Amino acid sequence: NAFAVSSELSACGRARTYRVEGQLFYGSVEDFMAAFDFREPLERVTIDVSRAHIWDISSVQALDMAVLKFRREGAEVRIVGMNEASETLVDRL
Amino acid sequence: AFAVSSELARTYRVEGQLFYGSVEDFMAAFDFREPLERVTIDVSRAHIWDISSVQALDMAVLKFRREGAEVRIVGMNEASETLVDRLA
Per-position DSSP letters for B2-42, written without gaps between them: EEEEEE--EEEEEEEEE-GGGHHHHHTT--SSS--SEEEEE
CA end-to-end distance (rounded Å), chain B: 24
Interior angle at CA A11, CA A22 and CA A41, nearest 5: 75
Does the N-terminal peptide bond of residue B68 adopt cis geometry, omega within 30 degrees of 0?
yes
Task: Give break positions in chain A: residue before each, C–N beyond 2.5 Å.
Answer: none
Q: How was this structure determined?
A: X-ray
Length of chain A: 93
For chain A, domains (ranges, CATH) are 1-93 (3.30.750.24)
* A3-8 contact pairs (CB < 8 A, 24+): A3/A28, A3/A31, A3/A32, A3/A52, A5/A32, A5/A35, A5/A36, A7/A35
Cβ-Cβ contacts under 8 Å, B83 against chain A? 55
Size of interface A-B (CB pairs under 8 A): 39
Closest CA relative to residue A24, chosen from A53, A61, A45 = A53
Nearest alpha carbon to residue B62 among A89, A21, A27: A21
Chain B positions touching A25 (Cβ under 8 A) are 51, 87
CA distance A78 to A55: 20
